[PDB]
Amino acid sequence: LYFQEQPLRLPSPEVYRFVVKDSEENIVFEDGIPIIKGGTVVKLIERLTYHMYADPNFVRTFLTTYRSFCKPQELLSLLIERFEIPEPEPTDADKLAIEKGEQPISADLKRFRKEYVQPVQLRILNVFRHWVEHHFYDFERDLELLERLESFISSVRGKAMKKWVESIAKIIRRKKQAITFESPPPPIEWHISKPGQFETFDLMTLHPIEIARQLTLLESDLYRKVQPSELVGSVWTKEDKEINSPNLLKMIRHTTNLTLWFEKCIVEAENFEERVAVLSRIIEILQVFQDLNNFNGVLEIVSAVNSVSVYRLDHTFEALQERKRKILDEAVELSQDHFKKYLVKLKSINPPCVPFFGIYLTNILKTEEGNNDFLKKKGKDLINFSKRRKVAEITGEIQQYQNQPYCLRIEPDMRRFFENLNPMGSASEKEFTDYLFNKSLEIEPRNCKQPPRFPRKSTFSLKSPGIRPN
Protein backbone atom coordinates (compact mmCIF):
# COMPACT_ATOMS: atom_id res chain seq x y z
CA LEU A 1 0.00 0.00 0.00
CA TYR A 2 2.80 2.42 0.96
CA PHE A 3 5.50 0.43 -0.88
CA GLN A 4 5.49 -1.91 -3.87
CA GLU A 5 6.98 -5.32 -3.13
CA GLN A 6 8.75 -7.61 -5.59
CA PRO A 7 6.15 -9.27 -7.88
CA LEU A 8 5.24 -12.93 -7.53
CA ARG A 9 6.56 -15.11 -10.37
CA LEU A 10 3.79 -17.20 -11.96
CA PRO A 11 3.58 -19.88 -14.67
CA SER A 12 2.61 -19.07 -18.22
CA PRO A 13 -1.10 -18.70 -19.07
CA GLU A 14 -0.42 -21.30 -21.80
CA VAL A 15 -0.05 -23.99 -19.11
CA TYR A 16 -2.31 -22.52 -16.41
CA ARG A 17 -5.11 -20.35 -17.73
CA PHE A 18 -5.96 -19.02 -14.24
CA VAL A 19 -3.01 -16.56 -14.35
CA VAL A 20 -4.27 -14.68 -17.41
CA LYS A 21 -4.09 -10.99 -16.52
CA ASP A 22 -7.25 -9.48 -15.09
CA SER A 23 -9.01 -7.07 -17.42
CA GLU A 24 -12.45 -5.71 -18.23
CA GLU A 25 -12.80 -8.47 -20.85
CA ASN A 26 -12.74 -11.36 -18.36
CA ILE A 27 -13.75 -9.95 -14.94
CA VAL A 28 -15.67 -6.92 -13.64
CA PHE A 29 -16.23 -5.65 -10.11
CA GLU A 30 -18.80 -3.39 -8.52
CA ASP A 31 -17.60 0.22 -8.28
CA GLY A 32 -13.44 -5.12 2.49
CA ILE A 33 -12.66 -7.44 -0.44
CA PRO A 34 -14.07 -6.40 -3.84
CA ILE A 35 -17.54 -7.48 -4.91
CA ILE A 36 -17.50 -9.39 -8.20
CA LYS A 37 -19.98 -8.18 -10.81
CA GLY A 38 -19.20 -10.87 -13.37
CA GLY A 39 -16.61 -12.60 -15.47
CA THR A 40 -15.60 -15.79 -17.17
CA VAL A 41 -16.19 -19.00 -15.25
CA VAL A 42 -12.40 -19.41 -15.19
CA LYS A 43 -12.01 -16.03 -13.47
CA LEU A 44 -14.85 -16.82 -11.06
CA ILE A 45 -13.08 -20.07 -10.12
CA GLU A 46 -9.85 -18.12 -9.55
CA ARG A 47 -11.48 -15.59 -7.23
CA LEU A 48 -13.38 -18.48 -5.63
CA THR A 49 -9.94 -19.81 -4.63
CA TYR A 50 -7.96 -16.57 -4.51
CA HIS A 51 -4.49 -16.82 -2.95
CA MET A 52 -4.37 -13.36 -1.36
CA TYR A 53 -7.28 -13.89 1.06
CA ALA A 54 -10.34 -15.96 1.87
CA ASP A 55 -13.81 -14.91 0.71
CA PRO A 56 -16.50 -16.75 2.69
CA ASN A 57 -19.43 -14.77 1.26
CA PHE A 58 -18.37 -15.44 -2.34
CA VAL A 59 -17.90 -19.17 -1.61
CA ARG A 60 -21.35 -19.54 -0.07
CA THR A 61 -23.15 -17.58 -2.80
CA PHE A 62 -21.21 -19.32 -5.58
CA LEU A 63 -22.03 -22.79 -4.26
CA THR A 64 -25.73 -21.90 -3.94
CA THR A 65 -26.04 -20.35 -7.41
CA TYR A 66 -23.37 -21.89 -9.67
CA ARG A 67 -25.72 -24.40 -11.33
CA SER A 68 -27.22 -21.49 -13.29
CA PHE A 69 -23.97 -21.10 -15.25
CA CYS A 70 -21.88 -24.26 -14.75
CA LYS A 71 -22.41 -27.98 -14.41
CA PRO A 72 -21.50 -29.94 -11.25
CA GLN A 73 -19.02 -32.03 -13.27
CA GLU A 74 -17.80 -28.83 -14.94
CA LEU A 75 -17.14 -27.31 -11.52
CA LEU A 76 -15.28 -30.33 -10.14
CA SER A 77 -13.03 -30.38 -13.21
CA LEU A 78 -12.35 -26.65 -12.84
CA LEU A 79 -11.35 -27.04 -9.18
CA ILE A 80 -9.01 -29.91 -10.11
CA GLU A 81 -7.58 -27.72 -12.88
CA ARG A 82 -6.98 -25.00 -10.29
CA PHE A 83 -5.31 -27.49 -7.93
CA GLU A 84 -2.69 -28.88 -10.35
CA ILE A 85 -0.45 -25.81 -10.51
CA PRO A 86 2.71 -26.01 -12.65
CA GLU A 87 5.78 -24.27 -11.36
CA PRO A 88 7.42 -21.48 -13.38
CA GLU A 89 10.13 -22.51 -15.81
CA PRO A 90 13.41 -22.54 -13.84
CA THR A 91 15.99 -20.04 -15.02
CA ASP A 92 19.36 -21.10 -16.40
CA ALA A 93 21.02 -20.07 -13.12
CA ASP A 94 18.42 -22.07 -11.17
CA LYS A 95 19.13 -25.24 -13.15
CA LEU A 96 22.87 -24.89 -12.49
CA ALA A 97 22.24 -24.80 -8.73
CA ILE A 98 20.26 -28.05 -8.83
CA GLU A 99 22.98 -29.66 -10.95
CA LYS A 100 25.63 -28.62 -8.42
CA GLY A 101 23.72 -30.21 -5.54
CA GLU A 102 22.93 -29.28 -1.93
CA GLN A 103 21.64 -25.85 -2.92
CA PRO A 104 18.51 -24.20 -1.44
CA ILE A 105 15.87 -23.56 -4.09
CA SER A 106 15.52 -20.09 -5.57
CA ALA A 107 13.90 -17.40 -3.43
CA ASP A 108 11.29 -16.96 -6.18
CA LEU A 109 10.34 -20.65 -6.16
CA LYS A 110 10.08 -20.65 -2.36
CA ARG A 111 7.82 -17.58 -2.50
CA PHE A 112 5.74 -19.22 -5.24
CA ARG A 113 5.09 -22.42 -3.29
CA LYS A 114 4.41 -20.66 0.00
CA GLU A 115 2.43 -17.61 -1.16
CA TYR A 116 0.56 -19.19 -4.07
CA VAL A 117 0.48 -22.98 -4.45
CA GLN A 118 -0.29 -23.84 -0.83
CA PRO A 119 -2.93 -21.11 -0.20
CA VAL A 120 -4.75 -21.81 -3.49
CA GLN A 121 -4.81 -25.57 -2.91
CA LEU A 122 -6.14 -24.98 0.62
CA ARG A 123 -8.89 -22.69 -0.69
CA ILE A 124 -9.92 -25.48 -3.06
CA LEU A 125 -10.09 -27.94 -0.18
CA ASN A 126 -12.21 -25.39 1.68
CA VAL A 127 -14.53 -25.21 -1.34
CA PHE A 128 -14.82 -29.02 -1.46
CA ARG A 129 -15.67 -28.99 2.27
CA HIS A 130 -18.38 -26.33 1.88
CA TRP A 131 -19.72 -28.25 -1.14
CA VAL A 132 -20.31 -31.61 0.55
CA GLU A 133 -21.47 -29.96 3.80
CA HIS A 134 -24.19 -27.72 2.36
CA HIS A 135 -24.86 -29.07 -1.15
CA PHE A 136 -24.52 -32.84 -0.77
CA TYR A 137 -27.62 -33.29 -2.95
CA ASP A 138 -25.27 -32.72 -5.91
CA PHE A 139 -23.59 -36.00 -4.95
CA GLU A 140 -26.84 -37.86 -4.22
CA ARG A 141 -28.09 -37.09 -7.74
CA ASP A 142 -24.77 -37.77 -9.49
CA LEU A 143 -22.75 -40.81 -8.40
CA GLU A 144 -19.82 -40.38 -10.80
CA LEU A 145 -19.52 -36.85 -9.39
CA LEU A 146 -18.92 -38.20 -5.88
CA GLU A 147 -16.53 -40.94 -7.01
CA ARG A 148 -14.44 -38.41 -8.94
CA LEU A 149 -14.17 -36.16 -5.88
CA GLU A 150 -13.30 -39.09 -3.62
CA SER A 151 -10.78 -40.35 -6.16
CA PHE A 152 -9.15 -36.92 -6.35
CA ILE A 153 -8.88 -36.28 -2.60
CA SER A 154 -7.26 -39.71 -2.32
CA SER A 155 -4.59 -38.48 -4.77
CA VAL A 156 -3.66 -35.49 -2.58
CA ARG A 157 -0.20 -35.87 -1.03
CA GLY A 158 1.16 -33.75 1.79
CA LYS A 159 1.02 -33.68 5.58
CA ALA A 160 -0.31 -30.11 5.64
CA MET A 161 -3.46 -31.19 3.78
CA LYS A 162 -4.22 -34.52 5.48
CA LYS A 163 -6.31 -32.72 8.11
CA TRP A 164 -8.45 -31.28 5.31
CA VAL A 165 -8.67 -34.53 3.31
CA GLU A 166 -9.83 -36.42 6.38
CA SER A 167 -12.32 -33.68 7.28
CA ILE A 168 -13.88 -33.92 3.80
CA ALA A 169 -14.14 -37.71 4.14
CA LYS A 170 -15.66 -37.37 7.61
CA ILE A 171 -18.37 -35.07 6.23
CA ILE A 172 -19.11 -37.40 3.32
CA ARG A 173 -19.34 -40.37 5.68
CA ARG A 174 -21.79 -38.49 7.92
CA LYS A 175 -23.89 -37.71 4.84
CA LYS A 176 -23.83 -41.17 3.24
CA GLN A 177 -25.43 -42.76 6.31
CA ALA A 178 -28.27 -40.23 6.79
CA ILE A 179 -39.13 -36.27 17.71
CA THR A 180 -38.35 -34.74 21.12
CA PHE A 181 -40.62 -32.30 22.94
CA GLU A 182 -39.24 -29.77 25.42
CA SER A 183 -42.75 -29.20 26.80
CA PRO A 184 -45.64 -31.66 26.32
CA PRO A 185 -47.62 -31.08 23.12
CA PRO A 186 -51.40 -30.70 23.55
CA PRO A 187 -53.62 -33.76 23.10
CA ILE A 188 -54.94 -34.65 19.66
CA GLU A 189 -58.41 -33.27 18.97
CA TRP A 190 -61.10 -35.45 17.41
CA HIS A 191 -64.60 -34.50 16.28
CA ILE A 192 -66.92 -36.96 14.55
CA SER A 193 -64.27 -39.16 12.95
CA LYS A 194 -62.41 -41.30 15.47
CA PRO A 195 -58.79 -42.53 15.56
CA GLY A 196 -58.21 -45.23 12.96
CA GLN A 197 -61.29 -44.54 10.81
CA PHE A 198 -59.25 -42.79 8.13
CA GLU A 199 -61.79 -43.87 5.48
CA THR A 200 -64.30 -41.37 6.94
CA PHE A 201 -61.96 -38.37 7.16
CA ASP A 202 -63.37 -35.20 5.60
CA LEU A 203 -63.48 -31.46 6.23
CA MET A 204 -66.54 -31.56 8.50
CA THR A 205 -65.75 -34.88 10.28
CA LEU A 206 -62.22 -34.09 11.42
CA HIS A 207 -61.77 -31.55 14.23
CA PRO A 208 -61.04 -28.00 13.01
CA ILE A 209 -58.20 -27.48 15.50
CA GLU A 210 -56.48 -30.68 14.35
CA ILE A 211 -56.97 -29.94 10.64
CA ALA A 212 -55.08 -26.70 11.23
CA ARG A 213 -52.50 -28.42 13.45
CA GLN A 214 -51.77 -31.23 11.00
CA LEU A 215 -51.66 -29.00 7.90
CA THR A 216 -49.29 -26.72 9.79
CA LEU A 217 -47.03 -29.65 10.65
CA LEU A 218 -47.09 -30.84 7.03
CA GLU A 219 -46.55 -27.35 5.58
CA SER A 220 -43.72 -26.79 8.08
CA ASP A 221 -41.77 -29.86 6.93
CA LEU A 222 -42.27 -28.98 3.27
CA TYR A 223 -41.09 -25.41 3.83
CA ARG A 224 -38.05 -26.55 5.84
CA LYS A 225 -36.75 -28.90 3.12
CA VAL A 226 -36.52 -26.29 0.33
CA GLN A 227 -32.91 -25.57 -0.63
CA PRO A 228 -31.93 -22.16 -2.03
CA SER A 229 -30.52 -23.71 -5.23
CA GLU A 230 -34.02 -24.97 -6.13
CA LEU A 231 -35.02 -21.31 -6.66
CA VAL A 232 -32.00 -19.91 -8.54
CA GLY A 233 -32.45 -19.48 -12.27
CA SER A 234 -36.17 -20.33 -12.12
CA VAL A 235 -35.05 -23.95 -12.52
CA TRP A 236 -38.37 -25.07 -11.04
CA THR A 237 -40.04 -23.69 -14.21
CA LYS A 238 -37.51 -25.26 -16.58
CA GLU A 239 -36.70 -28.49 -18.39
CA ASP A 240 -35.22 -30.54 -15.52
CA LYS A 241 -37.53 -29.07 -12.85
CA GLU A 242 -38.29 -32.44 -11.23
CA ILE A 243 -34.61 -33.18 -10.59
CA ASN A 244 -33.36 -29.72 -9.58
CA SER A 245 -36.32 -28.55 -7.48
CA PRO A 246 -38.01 -31.57 -5.86
CA ASN A 247 -38.72 -30.02 -2.45
CA LEU A 248 -39.89 -26.67 -3.85
CA LEU A 249 -42.24 -28.44 -6.26
CA LYS A 250 -43.73 -30.47 -3.40
CA MET A 251 -44.43 -27.17 -1.62
CA ILE A 252 -46.12 -25.58 -4.65
CA ARG A 253 -48.18 -28.68 -5.42
CA HIS A 254 -49.37 -29.07 -1.85
CA THR A 255 -50.60 -25.45 -2.00
CA THR A 256 -52.36 -26.04 -5.33
CA ASN A 257 -54.11 -29.19 -4.10
CA LEU A 258 -55.15 -27.73 -0.74
CA THR A 259 -56.52 -24.53 -2.31
CA LEU A 260 -58.53 -26.49 -4.89
CA TRP A 261 -59.68 -28.75 -2.04
CA PHE A 262 -61.18 -25.90 0.01
CA GLU A 263 -62.92 -24.59 -3.13
CA LYS A 264 -64.25 -28.08 -3.85
CA CYS A 265 -65.71 -28.44 -0.33
CA ILE A 266 -67.60 -25.14 -0.58
CA VAL A 267 -69.11 -25.51 -4.04
CA GLU A 268 -69.89 -29.24 -3.80
CA ALA A 269 -71.93 -28.58 -0.63
CA GLU A 270 -75.18 -27.98 -2.46
CA ASN A 271 -77.51 -27.63 0.54
CA PHE A 272 -77.43 -23.97 1.55
CA GLU A 273 -77.24 -24.41 5.33
CA GLU A 274 -74.58 -27.11 4.95
CA ARG A 275 -72.54 -24.82 2.69
CA VAL A 276 -72.57 -21.92 5.17
CA ALA A 277 -71.35 -24.39 7.81
CA VAL A 278 -68.50 -25.51 5.52
CA LEU A 279 -67.38 -21.92 4.92
CA SER A 280 -67.60 -21.19 8.64
CA ARG A 281 -65.54 -24.29 9.40
CA ILE A 282 -62.86 -23.11 6.96
CA ILE A 283 -62.75 -19.74 8.72
CA GLU A 284 -62.32 -21.59 12.02
CA ILE A 285 -59.38 -23.41 10.45
CA LEU A 286 -58.05 -20.03 9.32
CA GLN A 287 -58.15 -18.67 12.88
CA VAL A 288 -56.04 -21.53 14.24
CA PHE A 289 -53.65 -21.04 11.30
CA GLN A 290 -53.21 -17.47 12.56
CA ASP A 291 -52.85 -18.63 16.17
CA LEU A 292 -50.02 -20.91 14.99
CA ASN A 293 -48.46 -18.21 12.76
CA ASN A 294 -49.11 -20.37 9.68
CA PHE A 295 -49.51 -17.65 7.08
CA ASN A 296 -49.13 -20.13 4.24
CA GLY A 297 -52.23 -21.87 5.56
CA VAL A 298 -54.00 -18.52 6.01
CA LEU A 299 -53.34 -17.34 2.45
CA GLU A 300 -54.27 -20.70 0.92
CA ILE A 301 -57.72 -20.12 2.41
CA VAL A 302 -57.80 -16.50 1.21
CA SER A 303 -56.80 -17.88 -2.18
CA ALA A 304 -59.72 -20.34 -2.22
CA VAL A 305 -62.40 -17.79 -1.35
CA ASN A 306 -61.01 -15.42 -3.99
CA SER A 307 -61.60 -18.05 -6.70
CA VAL A 308 -64.41 -17.04 -9.05
CA SER A 309 -66.56 -20.08 -8.26
CA VAL A 310 -66.52 -19.23 -4.53
CA TYR A 311 -66.34 -15.41 -4.65
CA ARG A 312 -69.72 -15.12 -6.39
CA LEU A 313 -71.59 -17.03 -3.64
CA ASP A 314 -73.07 -13.86 -2.17
CA HIS A 315 -75.94 -15.55 -0.33
CA THR A 316 -73.45 -17.86 1.39
CA PHE A 317 -71.16 -15.04 2.53
CA GLU A 318 -74.15 -12.94 3.61
CA ALA A 319 -75.45 -15.75 5.83
CA LEU A 320 -72.14 -15.87 7.73
CA GLN A 321 -72.29 -14.63 11.30
CA GLU A 322 -70.71 -11.20 11.60
CA ARG A 323 -67.75 -12.33 13.71
CA LYS A 324 -66.44 -15.04 11.38
CA ARG A 325 -66.99 -12.66 8.46
CA LYS A 326 -64.76 -10.07 10.17
CA ILE A 327 -61.99 -12.61 10.83
CA LEU A 328 -62.01 -13.66 7.17
CA ASP A 329 -61.98 -10.06 5.94
CA GLU A 330 -58.97 -9.16 8.07
CA ALA A 331 -57.19 -12.19 6.58
CA VAL A 332 -58.12 -11.16 3.03
CA GLU A 333 -56.75 -7.67 3.69
CA LEU A 334 -53.34 -9.19 4.51
CA SER A 335 -52.86 -9.64 0.77
CA GLN A 336 -54.04 -6.23 -0.43
CA ASP A 337 -51.59 -3.62 -1.74
CA HIS A 338 -48.98 -6.25 -2.66
CA PHE A 339 -49.16 -7.89 0.79
CA LYS A 340 -48.30 -4.65 2.58
CA LYS A 341 -50.04 -5.67 5.81
CA TYR A 342 -48.78 -9.26 5.58
CA LEU A 343 -45.16 -8.12 5.42
CA VAL A 344 -45.32 -6.02 8.59
CA LYS A 345 -46.97 -8.88 10.49
CA LEU A 346 -44.36 -11.41 9.37
CA LYS A 347 -41.60 -9.16 10.72
CA SER A 348 -43.28 -9.01 14.15
CA ILE A 349 -44.10 -12.64 14.95
CA ASN A 350 -42.03 -15.00 17.10
CA PRO A 351 -41.19 -18.54 15.93
CA PRO A 352 -42.46 -21.08 15.13
CA CYS A 353 -44.14 -19.93 11.91
CA VAL A 354 -44.78 -20.92 8.30
CA PRO A 355 -44.30 -17.95 5.94
CA PHE A 356 -46.31 -17.42 2.80
CA PHE A 357 -44.23 -19.04 0.08
CA GLY A 358 -45.78 -17.28 -2.92
CA ILE A 359 -44.16 -13.92 -2.25
CA TYR A 360 -40.65 -15.36 -2.60
CA LEU A 361 -41.45 -17.23 -5.82
CA THR A 362 -43.01 -14.09 -7.28
CA ASN A 363 -40.15 -11.78 -6.26
CA ILE A 364 -37.57 -14.24 -7.61
CA LEU A 365 -39.30 -14.41 -11.00
CA LYS A 366 -39.06 -10.63 -11.29
CA THR A 367 -35.32 -10.70 -10.58
CA GLU A 368 -35.01 -13.41 -13.23
CA GLU A 369 -36.67 -11.30 -15.93
CA GLY A 370 -35.11 -8.04 -14.70
CA ASN A 371 -31.47 -9.13 -14.94
CA ASN A 372 -29.68 -10.60 -17.95
CA ASP A 373 -27.70 -13.81 -17.52
CA PHE A 374 -24.69 -12.26 -19.30
CA LEU A 375 -22.84 -8.98 -19.62
CA LYS A 376 -22.23 -7.81 -23.19
CA LYS A 377 -18.62 -7.67 -24.43
CA LYS A 378 -16.75 -7.45 -27.72
CA GLY A 379 -15.59 -11.05 -27.48
CA LYS A 380 -16.80 -13.67 -25.03
CA ASP A 381 -19.70 -12.46 -22.90
CA LEU A 382 -19.21 -12.51 -19.14
CA ILE A 383 -21.37 -14.32 -16.61
CA ASN A 384 -23.57 -11.86 -14.71
CA PHE A 385 -22.85 -12.86 -11.11
CA SER A 386 -24.45 -9.83 -9.45
CA LYS A 387 -27.76 -11.25 -10.68
CA ARG A 388 -27.04 -14.53 -8.88
CA ARG A 389 -26.08 -12.62 -5.73
CA LYS A 390 -29.39 -10.72 -5.84
CA VAL A 391 -31.38 -13.96 -6.04
CA ALA A 392 -29.21 -15.40 -3.27
CA GLU A 393 -30.18 -12.44 -1.07
CA ILE A 394 -33.83 -13.48 -1.34
CA THR A 395 -33.14 -17.19 -0.78
CA GLY A 396 -31.39 -16.25 2.44
CA GLU A 397 -34.67 -14.76 3.64
CA ILE A 398 -36.33 -18.17 3.27
CA GLN A 399 -33.74 -20.01 5.37
CA GLN A 400 -34.08 -17.82 8.48
CA TYR A 401 -37.47 -19.43 9.28
CA GLN A 402 -36.68 -23.09 8.58
CA ASN A 403 -35.29 -24.10 12.01
CA GLN A 404 -38.49 -23.55 14.04
CA PRO A 405 -40.25 -26.78 15.06
CA TYR A 406 -43.83 -26.74 16.25
CA CYS A 407 -44.85 -28.21 19.61
CA LEU A 408 -47.52 -30.38 17.97
CA ARG A 409 -47.79 -34.16 17.71
CA ILE A 410 -48.10 -35.80 14.29
CA GLU A 411 -51.33 -37.69 13.57
CA PRO A 412 -50.20 -40.23 10.92
CA ASP A 413 -53.61 -41.00 9.40
CA MET A 414 -54.59 -37.35 9.01
CA ARG A 415 -51.07 -36.72 7.67
CA ARG A 416 -51.61 -39.31 4.91
CA PHE A 417 -55.04 -37.79 4.22
CA PHE A 418 -53.71 -34.32 3.39
CA GLU A 419 -50.74 -35.78 1.50
CA ASN A 420 -53.16 -37.75 -0.70
CA LEU A 421 -55.83 -35.12 -1.42
CA ASN A 422 -56.80 -35.30 -5.11
CA PRO A 423 -59.61 -32.75 -5.56
CA MET A 424 -59.38 -32.78 -9.38
CA GLY A 425 -59.96 -36.53 -9.67
CA SER A 426 -59.50 -37.51 -13.32
CA ALA A 427 -60.29 -34.02 -14.63
CA SER A 428 -57.69 -31.59 -15.88
CA GLU A 429 -57.13 -28.28 -14.11
CA LYS A 430 -59.08 -26.66 -16.94
CA GLU A 431 -61.85 -29.26 -16.76
CA PHE A 432 -62.04 -29.00 -12.96
CA THR A 433 -62.17 -25.19 -13.06
CA ASP A 434 -65.13 -25.20 -15.47
CA TYR A 435 -66.87 -27.86 -13.38
CA LEU A 436 -66.52 -25.78 -10.20
CA PHE A 437 -67.98 -22.64 -11.73
CA ASN A 438 -70.77 -24.66 -13.34
CA LYS A 439 -71.58 -26.13 -9.92
CA SER A 440 -71.45 -22.62 -8.45
CA LEU A 441 -73.96 -21.36 -11.02
CA GLU A 442 -76.17 -24.31 -10.07
CA ILE A 443 -76.18 -23.75 -6.31
CA GLU A 444 -76.65 -19.95 -6.50
CA PRO A 445 -77.98 -19.05 -9.96
CA ARG A 446 -77.50 -15.54 -11.33
CA ASN A 447 -79.88 -12.92 -9.91
CA CYS A 448 -81.57 -15.33 -7.49
CA LYS A 449 -82.90 -13.75 -4.31
CA GLN A 450 -83.06 -17.02 -2.35
CA PRO A 451 -80.58 -19.90 -2.83
CA PRO A 452 -82.36 -22.91 -4.33
CA ARG A 453 -83.26 -25.79 -2.03
CA PHE A 454 -81.04 -28.89 -2.25
CA PRO A 455 -81.13 -32.04 -0.09
CA ARG A 456 -78.78 -32.27 2.88
CA LYS A 457 -75.73 -34.46 2.24
CA SER A 458 -75.11 -35.72 5.80
CA THR A 459 -77.21 -36.62 8.82
CA PHE A 460 -74.88 -35.31 11.51
CA SER A 461 -75.10 -31.90 13.12
CA LEU A 462 -73.78 -28.80 11.37
CA LYS A 463 -72.63 -27.35 14.71
CA SER A 464 -68.89 -26.91 14.90
CA PRO A 465 -67.13 -28.13 18.06
CA GLY A 466 -65.25 -24.82 18.00
CA ILE A 467 -61.60 -23.86 18.23
CA ARG A 468 -61.32 -24.09 22.03
CA PRO A 469 -59.18 -27.08 23.12
CA ASN A 470 -60.47 -29.40 25.82
Ligand X SMILES: CC(C)N1CCN(c2nc(Nc3ccc4[nH]ccc4c3)nc3c2CCCC3)CC1
Name the residue nearer to ligand X (CB basis): 314 or 434.
314
Shortest gap between Cβ of 334 and ligand X (angstroms)?
Answer: 12
Shortest gap between Cβ of 322 and ligand X (angstroms)?
Answer: 8
Name the residue nearer to ligand X (CB basis): 24 or 329.
329
Name the residue nearer to ligand X (CB basis): 24 or 314.
314
Shortest gap between Cβ of 231 and ligand X (angstroms)?
Answer: 30
Name the residue nearer to ligand X (CB basis): 148 or 325.
325
Residues in touch with ligand X (CB under 6 A): 305-306, 311, 314, 317-318, 325, 328-329, 332
Name the residue nearer to ligand X (CB basis): 311 or 374.
311
Shortest gap between Cβ of 330 and ligand X (angstroms)?
Answer: 10
Shortest gap between Cβ of 318 and ligand X (angstroms)?
Answer: 5
How far apart are the C-alpha atoms of 136 and 304, rounded to whole Å? 37
Name the residue nearer to ligand X (CB basis): 224 or 325.
325
Cα 39 to chain centroid, rounded: 26
Shortest gap between Cβ of 300 and ligand X (angstroms)?
Answer: 13
Shortest gap between Cβ of 298 and ligand X (angstroms)?
Answer: 13
Exposure on the CB side of residue 82, measured as CA atoms within 13 A: 28
Shortest gap between Cβ of 325 and ligand X (angstroms)?
Answer: 5
Name the residue nearer to ligand X (CB basis): 102 or 322.
322
Beta bridge partners of 384: 38
Helical packing angle, 295-306 and 208-224, nearest 10°: 110
Q: Are 82 and 18 within 8 A, CB to CB?
A: yes
Shortest gap between Cβ of 328 and ligand X (angstroms)?
Answer: 5
Name the residue nearer to ligand X (CB basis): 211 or 305.
305
Name the residue nearer to ligand X (CB basis): 291 or 318.
318
Name the residue nearer to ligand X (CB basis): 252 or 319.
319
Shortest gap between Cβ of 333 and ligand X (angstroms)?
Answer: 9
